[PDB]
Amino acid sequence: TYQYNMNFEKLGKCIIINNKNFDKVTGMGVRNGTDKDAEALFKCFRSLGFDVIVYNDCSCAKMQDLLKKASEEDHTNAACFACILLSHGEENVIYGKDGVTPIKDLTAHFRGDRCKTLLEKPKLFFIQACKIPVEADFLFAYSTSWRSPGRGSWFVQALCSILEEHGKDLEIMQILTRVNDRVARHFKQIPCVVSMLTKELYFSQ
Amino acid sequence: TTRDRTYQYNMNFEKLGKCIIINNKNFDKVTGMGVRNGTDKDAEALFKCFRSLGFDVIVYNDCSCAKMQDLLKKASEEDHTNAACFACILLSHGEENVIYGKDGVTPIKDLTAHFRGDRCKTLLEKPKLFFIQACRKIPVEADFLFAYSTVPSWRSPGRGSWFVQALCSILEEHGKDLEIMQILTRVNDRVARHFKQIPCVVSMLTKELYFSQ
Ligand SMILES: CC(=O)c1ccccc1Sc1ccccc1C(=O)O
C-alpha cells in the first residue's frame, strides 16, 4: 500500500554505462579509477538482484540507443529499472566518447508515456560526473563529483558499502541519506537525490 | 517492510525553528504576471500546518525581490543556536530556477544561499527546508531539502493548490510520526493519483528528519 510492489519475477535490469576514455574532439581526460568503481557497482547491484550489464566507452548515439532499446524491452516481470552512468559531465548533460548527450534525453525513453511496461514502477538513475503523470516514479542520485584513482569515487564506495550492508532492510531514501552523510563526513562536496517516487522503495518483498 | 525509531537529526532544542512563508498574490503590471487567486488560502493552511508542528511561523505578503532577499539574509544572520531546523515556504510565480517578487524575478539559488554552511554558522548540521510552489569541515550545501510543487503547476482559485492541500493533510495526520521523505513521498503520490502533475523533492539531508521528541 505504501511500498512499490516487489512481487515480481526479477528485480530488474541494471545498465551500467562506464566511460573511461574519450575522443580527440572531446578533449577530456582518462577517468582512472572507474574500473574500480564500475566493478564495485557490478557486485552491489548484482547482490541486490539486478540483471547488470556493463558497457564501456560509449558514444552518445550508443548511450541513446542503449537506453532506447532498454526502454523498448518488456518489463512486465520486472519490479524496477536501474541505470548507472559513470562519466564526465557539465550541468544537465553527460558525456559520451564522441561528444555530449543531455541526461534529460536518456531518461525520456522511460517516461510513463513511452514505456508502458515500467509504468508505476521505480526508474532509478545513478549518475556520477567529474491517469498517471509522465514524470512520476523516477529517482536520481547524483554525486555533486571527484574520483580517486586507486579506491574509486567517494560516492561509489559509500553507496556500495551501505548497499551491501543494508540493501535489503532500508528504504531507498534512507540508504541514499546515509550515503550523503558518509560522503560529506569522511572524505569537500555532497551528493544530491532528486526523487519523484510515489512509494517507499525496498529491494525485498 | 515497516520501520520504527545517531541516524536522526537531533531534536533536543528549545525551538523547532523559524518558518518563513512568503505569500505573493499581486504583481506589478509590468511583469505581465496575473493575480494568483487561491494563494491566500494556501498560505493559511500552511501557517496552520507549520504552527501545529512547532514552528515559529511568520507570513510576508506581496514582497518585492529586494524584500525577499533581505528578509532571508537577515533570517540567516539571526541566532538559531536554540532551534532544531529552519523552514522557508515560497508561494509565487516561478520559471526555471527563478521566483517572482512583485516587481521582477530573482534566482532561487540566491535566496537559499544565505543559509549555506559558510554563511549561516548557526544552522550548520541542521536541516534547512525549502518548500516552493511556483506556478510555471562540512560541505556548504549539506542538510538542505527542496520540495518543489512540480518538476523543472496548477492551482484552484477556490480550492487552493494541489501540493499544499496534500502536504498539509499529510502533515496533520502524520507530521509527528513520519520521516520527512516518507511525508514528501506520500504527498507525491497524492498530487499524482488525487488529481497531470508531479512534485519533485531534492534532498541533501545527511540524517533522517522527524519533527518530534
Ligand atoms: C543545485 C540545487 O540543487 C539547488 C536547487 C535550488 C536552489 C539552489 C540550489 S544550489 C544549493 C543546493 C543545496 C544547498 C544549497 C544550495 C545553494 O548554494 O543555495
User: What are the residue ranges spanned by the domains of chain B?
Assistant: 1-213
CA–CA separation, B163 and B180 (whole Å):
15
CATH topology for B1-213 is Rossmann fold (3.40.50)
CA distance B166 to chain A (A): 13
Inter-chain contact B189–A176, Cβ cutoff 8 Å?
no
Joined together, the cell numbers standing for residue B92 give: 509565487
Q: How far is CA A200 from the centre of its chain?
A: 18
Q: Which of A192, A194, A200 sits opposite B200 (nearest CB)?
A: A194
Pocket of ligand 1, beta carbon within 6 A: A 192; B 108-109, 112-113, 116, 141, 144, 146, 202, 204
**CATH class of domain segment(s) A1-205:** alpha beta
Locate the DSSP E strands across A88-197: 93-96, 99-102, 123-129, 138-142, 147-148, 152-153, 192-195
Which DSSP helix (H) or strand (E) runs through A43?
helix A34-48
Distance B87 CA to ligand 1 centre (A): 15
CA–CA separation, B112 and A204 (whole Å):
37
Q: Which of B151, B197, B207 sits opposite A181 (nearest CB)?
A: B207
Joined together, the cell numbers standing for residue B44 give: 493559511
Tell me how the structure was determined. X-ray
Q: Output the CA angle B97-B93-A173, nearest 5 degrees.
A: 55
Does residue A130 carry a catalytic annotation? yes
Neighbours of A8 (CB within 10 A): 16
Sort residue B38 into left (φ over 0), alpha (ψ -120 to 50) or beta: left
Which positions in chain A touch B146 (Cβ < 8 Å)?
A: none
Identity (one letter) of the amino acid at B107? P
Sort residue A43 into left (φ over 0), alpha (ψ -120 to 50) or beta: alpha
From the CA of B108, give the closest atom in ligand 1: 7
Of A64, A126, A65, A127, nearest in space to A101 by CA? A64
Of A141, A139, A137, nearest in space to A156 by CA? A141
Inter-chain contact A202–B141, Cβ cutoff 8 Å?
no
Sort residue B103 into left (φ over 0), alpha (ψ -120 to 50) or beta: alpha
Identity (one letter) of the amino acid at A191? P
